Amino acid sequence: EPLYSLRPEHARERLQDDSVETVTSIEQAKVEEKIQEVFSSYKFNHLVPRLVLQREKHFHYLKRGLRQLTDAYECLDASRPWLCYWILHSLELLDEPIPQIVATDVCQFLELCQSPDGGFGGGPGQYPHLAPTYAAVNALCIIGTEEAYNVINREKLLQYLYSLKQPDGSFLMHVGGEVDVRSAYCAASVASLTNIITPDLFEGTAEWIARCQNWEGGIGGVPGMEAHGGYTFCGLAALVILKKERSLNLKSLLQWVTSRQMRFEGGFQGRCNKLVDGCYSFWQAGLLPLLHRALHAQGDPALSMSHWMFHQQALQEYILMCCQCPAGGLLDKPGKSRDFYHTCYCLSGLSIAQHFGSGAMLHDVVMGVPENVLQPTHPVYNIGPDKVIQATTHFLQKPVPGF
Amino acid sequence: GFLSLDSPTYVLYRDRAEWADIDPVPQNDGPSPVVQIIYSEKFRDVYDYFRAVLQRDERSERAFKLTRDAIELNAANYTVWHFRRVLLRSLQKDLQEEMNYITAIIEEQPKNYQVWHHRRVLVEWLKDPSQELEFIADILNQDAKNYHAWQHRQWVIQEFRLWDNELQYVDQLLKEDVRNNSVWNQRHFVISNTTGYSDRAVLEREVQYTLEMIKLVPHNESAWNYLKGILQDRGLSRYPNLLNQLLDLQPSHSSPYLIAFLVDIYEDMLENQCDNKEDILNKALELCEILAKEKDTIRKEYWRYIGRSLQSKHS
Ligand SMILES: Cn1cncc1[C@H](O)C1=Cc2cccnc2[C@@H](N2CCN(C(=O)OC(C)(C)C)CC2)c2ccc(Cl)cc21
Ligand SMILES: CC(C)=CCC/C(C)=C/CC/C(C)=C/COP(=O)(O)OP(=O)(O)O
Ligand SMILES: [Mg+2]
Ligand SMILES: [Zn+2]
Numbered sequence: 001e002p003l004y005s006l007r008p009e010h011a012r013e014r015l016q017d018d019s020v021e022t023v024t025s026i027e028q029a030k031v032e033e034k035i036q037e038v039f040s041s042y043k044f045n046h047l048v049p050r051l052v053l054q055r056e057k058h059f060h061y062l063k064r065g066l067r068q069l070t071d072a073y074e075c076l077d078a079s080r081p082w083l084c085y086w087i088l089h090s091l092e093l094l095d096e097p098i099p100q101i102v103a104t105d106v107c108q109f110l111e112l113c114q115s116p117d118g119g120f121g122g123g124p125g126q127y128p129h130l131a132p133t134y135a136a137v138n139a140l141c142i143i144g145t146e147e148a149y150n151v152i153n154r155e156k157l158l159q160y161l162y163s164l165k166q167p168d169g170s171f172l173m174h175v176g177g178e179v180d181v182r183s184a185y186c187a188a189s190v191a192s193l194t195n196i197i198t199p200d201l202f203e204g205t206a207e208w209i210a211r212c213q214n215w216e217g218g219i220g221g222v223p224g225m226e227a228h229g230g231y232t233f234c235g236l237a238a239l240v241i242l243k244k245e246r247s248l249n250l251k252s253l254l255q256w257v258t259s260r261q262m263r264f265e266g267g268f269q270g271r272c273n274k275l276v277d278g279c280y281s282f283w284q285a286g287l288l289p290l291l292h293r294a295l296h297a298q299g300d301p302a303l304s305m306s307h308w309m310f311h312q313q314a315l316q317e318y319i320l321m322c323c324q325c326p327a328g329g330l331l332d333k334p335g336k337s338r339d340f341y342h343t344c345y346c347l348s349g350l351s352i353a354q355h356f357g358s359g360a361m362l363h364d365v366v367m368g369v370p371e372n373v374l375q376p377t378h379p380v381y382n383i384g385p386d387k388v389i390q391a392t393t394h395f396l397q398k399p400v401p402g403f
Numbered sequence: 404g405f406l407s408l409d410s411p412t413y414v415l416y417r418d419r420a421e422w423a424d425i426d427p428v429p430q431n432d433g434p435s436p437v438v439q440i441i442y443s444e445k446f447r448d449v450y451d452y453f454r455a456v457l458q459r460d461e462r463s464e465r466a467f468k469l470t471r472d473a474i475e476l477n478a479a480n481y482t483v484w485h486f487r488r489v490l491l492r493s494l495q496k497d498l499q500e501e502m503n504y505i506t507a508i509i510e511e512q513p514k515n516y517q518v519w520h521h522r523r524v525l526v527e528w529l530k531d532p533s534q535e536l537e538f539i540a541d542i543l544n545q546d547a548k549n550y551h552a553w554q555h556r557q558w559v560i561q562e563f564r565l566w567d568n569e570l571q572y573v574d575q576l577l578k579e580d581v582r583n584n585s586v587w588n589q590r591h592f593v594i595s596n597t598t599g600y601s602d603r604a605v606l607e608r609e610v611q612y613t614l615e616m617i618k619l620v621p622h623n624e625s626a627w628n629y630l631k632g633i634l635q636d637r638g639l640s641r642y643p644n645l646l647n648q649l650l651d652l653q654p655s656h657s658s659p660y661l662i663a664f665l666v667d668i669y670e671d672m673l674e675n676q677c678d679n680k681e682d683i684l685n686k687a688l689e690l691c692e693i694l695a696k697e698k699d700t701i702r703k704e705y706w707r708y709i710g711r712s713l714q715s716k717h718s
Contacts, residue, residue, distance in 0.1 A: 013701070016622040016658075023547065024582035067436065071443045077450070078480040083438040105435040112433055124431050125454065126482045176485060178520045215591045215632030221550070224557045224596075226588040228550065252635070258705040259624070266701070272584040273625050274548065302711035309704045 003049055003367075005039050005266055005317045013264040024273050031275050034334050035265050038322050051320040051368025053350070054328065058343065059096055061328030062087050065340055066102065078122035081113055081135035086344035088142045092384055093347045093374045103143045110136045111151050118153060118160030128160055129174040130186035137190045138383050141391040149394050155401040158196040161187050169204025180221040181212050185234035188241040189381060193388070195395035206244035209235045213248050216272065217256030227256060229270040229283040236290050237380050245294040254295075257287045258309055266314030267322070267333075268349075277332045278323040278342050281349020282382065285310055289379035292358055306363040307356055315353040316367035319346050351377045405468065408445070408475045415445065416452040421465060427451030428458055446476050457486055462493040471504070478508065478515045488524060498529050506538060513542050519551040523558060532563040540572070547576060548585045557592055569593045581616055587625045591632065600633055609633055614648075621656040631667060640671040659699040666690045666709065673717045684717050 001007065015032055017025040042049040066087045069076075076083060084106055091098065098106075112124035113136060119128030120136035140148040164172040164183065171183035184205055191197045211223040212235055218227025219235035236253065239245045260268045260280070267276040268284035288308040295303055323330045323346045329338030330346035351374040356363040366373045378388045406413055416422050429451055432439055442450070453473045456466040470487040473480060491501060505522045512518060526532055536559065542552040560569060570593050576586040598605045610633070616626040634642060646668050649661060669687035677683055688710055695706035 018620045018622055020581070020620045022580040022582050024580055066438065069438060069440045071441055071446070073440045074442060074446050075477055075479060077440060077442075077446075077477050078482065080438050087438070101435075102437075105433075105437050108433050108435070109437045112431060121482070122480075124433075125457075126480075127485060129481055174481060176488065176524075177481065178516065214588070216588075216628055217632075220588075221554060224561070224592050225554055226550065226585050254705070258702050259628075261701050263699070263701040271548075272628060273582045273623075274584070300712075302708055302715050304704065304708065307704055309708055311701050311703065314701060 001049070003051070003317055004311070004314050005321070006042070006049060010039075010264075015264070027275060028273075031333065032264055035276075035322060038334055051317070051372065053320060053368070053372040053374075054324055054326075055094055055371070057326070057328030058090070058330070058347075059094060059328075061325075061338070062090050062094075062096070062340075062343070066091075078126060078129075079132065079135075080123045081110060081120055081132040081139060082122075083340055084110065084139040085135040085142070086340040088139050089377075089383060090340070090343050090347050092142055092387075093351055093377065095375050098143060100145075103145055104147065106139060106143060107145075107148050107151050110140060114151065114153065115160070116156070118156030118158070118163075127174060129177070130164065130171065130183050131173065133157075133160070134186035134189055137193055138381065141193060141381075141387050142383050144387050144390050146394075149391070152194055154194050154196055154395075154398065157190065157194060158198070158201075158401050161191060161196070161201060165201070167204075169202075169206070169208035171205075181209060181219060181231045181234045181238070182221070184209055185238040188238040192241045193381070193391050193395065195392070195398055196400060198400055202242055206239060206242050206247045209239055209244075210247040213253065217249065217252030217254075218260075219248075219253075226271060229257075229260060229268065229280050229287075232257065233283045233286055233290075236287055236294075240290055240293065240380050245290075245297075250291060250294055253287070254291050254309065257284055257291070260284045261310050261315070262318075265318055265322070266311065267318035268315070275333070276318070278319060278330060278349070279332065279345035281315055281319055281323075282345040282352065285315055285349050285352050286379050286382070289352060289357075293379075296358060303358070304356075305358065305361045307365070308352070310353075312353045312356075312365045313367055316350060316365070316372075319350050319353070320368055320372070347374060348377050348382055350374055352379065405471070408449075408472050413445075415448045416469070417448055422452065425452065425455050428454035430454065449473050449476055453483060453486075457482070462490055464494065466490060467494060467496070474508070478512050478517055481517055484517050484521060488521070498525055501525055502529070502534065506534075509538075509542065513546060513549055514551065516551065519555050523555065526559070532559050532565065535559045535563075536565060536568075536572075543576070547580060547583050550585070553585050553589065556589070560593075561596070566593065566597050570597075577616075581620055582623050582625055584625045584628075587629045591629065600636065606633065618652070618656055621652075622658050622660070624660060627658075627660040627664060631664060635667075638671050638675060639668045640675045640677065659694060662690050662694055662698060666694070670709075670713065673713065680717065684713060687713055 015025060015028050113120045113132060115121055115128035117128065119133040121128050122132045137152065140151055163175065166179060170179045171187050172179055173183050191201060212219045214220055214227055216227040219232040220226055220228060221231045239247060262269055262276045265276040267278060268280035269276055270280050288310050292303060292308060322334050325331055325338035330343040331338050332342055354364055354366055354374060355376045376385055378385045381388050417427065449472045453469055456469060467490045470483055473483045502525050505518065505525060509518045509522060539552050539556045542549055560566060573586055573590045573593060576583060594600060600606050613626050613630045649664060652661060666687055669683050672683050691706045691710035695703040699706065
């Protein structure tokens with residue numbers, strides 16, 4: 001019918017296991033049967049399909065979570081700036097305002113997470129780490145007040161990034177920590193937003209990230225590892241920031257990412273032969289605007305002037321039909337419990353799937369009710385494009401710190 | 404003298420005699436809190452005591468046992484892991500007992516980043532990789548796609564030069580699940596770091612093995628990605644027999660993967676000044692249209708992009 005996933009021909013997209021069953025085919029078939037039940041529900045209940053983003057339920061879930069969380073969140077006690085970021089960004093995508101008092105309370109809490117040696121920890125008094133540093137800077141840029149900008153100690157932040165920098169061009173996540181592509185992205189994101197990029201900070205970084213692109217076309221956590229959506233987004237987004245996307249084979253990358261959209265489910269998988277997951281709506285589909293900008297900068301004449309190189313409609317259908325929790329919040333797939341991480345990325349991926357843009361060109365695809373339209377998101381930073389412009393302009397009136 | 408966190412006789416640190424001297428330090432969440440977690444009593448109790456030993460930098464046997472509880476409560480707390488490693492060195496703890504502990508904790512939470520990083524630090528300290536491959540194989544026996552397990556496996560093999568039995572282990576896992584992409588990745592990792600793919604006998608063996616895998620399971624994307632990945636290097640057009648050999652699977656072993664591979668062969672032929680240039684282009688454009696409209700419509704935008712791209716370049 002008007003919904004791609006509900007067309008009779010869509011039944012042909014089901015798994016073809018070639019009569020050879022393995023753990024992979026068995027697990028995929030189970031997910032497909034579950035998704036088919038969701039897709040068929042309208043037909044079985046004799047109702048007209050209505051794709052509605054449950055804005056009010058999502059807002060209630062988010063406004064509450066911003067102040068207080070159950071003990072189910074104990075496993076995120078060293079990730080508190082991530083929770084600020086996930087919630088504040090989900091509220092920004094839903095066009096929900098931050099009361100000036102809440103903005104102030106977030107600023108003050110992120111100040112407590114900030115290390116006297118630079119960067120942010122996952123909670124008050126915790127050691128600094130690149131992942132809560134990225135989340136804290138992103139959350140402060142979402143608030144975007146002078147008070148939020150002033151929380152960041154730019155000189156100590158630069159000193160902190162230098163303390164993690166490795167001779168091979170990579171970065172540690174934290175002191176005595178692990179090295180992987182996420183760290184290059186977390187460092188490049190905070191350094192570009194706060195205007196602390198010195199001539200040698202990212203020396204060898206582009207080359208180290210390019211060594212993470214493997215035989216599949218995608219990018220692994222470290223050289224030699226299996227290509228993965230989260231790492232591929234981190235790798236490409238860091239190269240966009242560094243203006244070094246050409247270090248990658250962009251065509252093998254384009255082919256690998258597009259192949260990650262599931263023909264049946266419509267959503268994206270994180271790796272080849274794994275299951276669909278709503279958060280890959282951002283990590284994987286977020287690569288298509290980055291590749292479009294990269295190919296366009298090389299003057300590609302065959303690029304679309306209205307759509308991203310993925311099925312925008314099928315992704316929105318997967319998110320709207322399978323990833324909404326009735327009580328508010330979004331999830332990985334049907335049968336999974338809601339969480340602020342999936343709420344953030346399902347809505348981020350929905351915004352990307354709704355909003356196309358390339359220079360002068362602007363084209364929206366809004367599946368279901370028109371009220372489903374979200375605020376746009378910057379494909380590099382995953383914060384509002386207006387917040388990116390405002391933060392960059394503000395930090396550009398400050399000099400890059402000296403030694 | 405361990406008192407397990409799940410033990411029916413576990414007692415809160417605030418009710419323990421050997422901890423009476425120390426005042427627990429509460430978390431400073433500020434006056435108006437945000438993303439405040441309503442911690443369970445057990446969690447709050449261990450973390451208020453951990454905050455006290457950390458703030459005073461107490462490098463004691465009791466602080467060491469306390470980190471085990473704090474890790475058990477939240478194994479992602481990297482500050483706790485850092486302090487535990489400070490204590491392992493300061494207290495001169497037996498690192499083989501610490502390996503027994505990390506083995507048990509990884510078995511419980513095999514997806515946690517911190518646990519694998521700690522195991523790597525221990526292996527580095529001990530300069531002992533002897534237990535590694537067998538421990539990883541036990542994790543992979545439970546989840547054959549565990550990304551941290553495969554990453555630790557590659558680190559182990561590369562660092563300690565344990566290449567010799569890896570292709571055999573890869574062959575075993577591929578028999579179990581030919582669709583396991585992490586295993587196809589390991590295959591490439593092993594070959595590229597040993598013989599390489601420049602050795603013609605190795606390349607031939609790999610392409611034949613992959614083609615036999617494709618015949619058994621034609622819709623298995625991993626084997627198709629692997630065949631492409633090992634040949635795309637020198638260029639698909641460099642292998643003239645490949646096209647005819649795939650075109651001979653068109654009635655029997657067809658899939659949008661076979662069709663997509665044909666388009667990749669045609670793209671490369673068109674870039675390397677092939678004979679019957681206009682014929683190749685139209686063959687490629689026909690397959691692009693079939694893929695976009697019929698066989699692979701989820702990728703319609705990609706296939707239309709390729710169609711336009713091929714036209715723009717090779718018209
Ligand atoms: C890779 N992937 C893709 N879908 C999911 C994942 C992973 O589960 C995953 C994603 C991720 C990405 C960025 C920052 N933090 C995390 C974190 N999540 C944990 C679960 N969670 C969460 O709310 O759980 C509750 C409180 C409901 C139990 C959301 C945050 C995490 C922490 C350790 C590890 Cl090994 C993996 C992950
Ligand atoms: C900026 C930043 C910190 C980005 C993080 C990116 C991200 C999502 C990373 C995931 C890394 C990883 C080892 C996943 C494996 O888990 P899995 O078993 O869930 O993978 P799968 O979904 O393919 O099964
Ligand atoms: Mg760590
Ligand atoms: Zn997910």
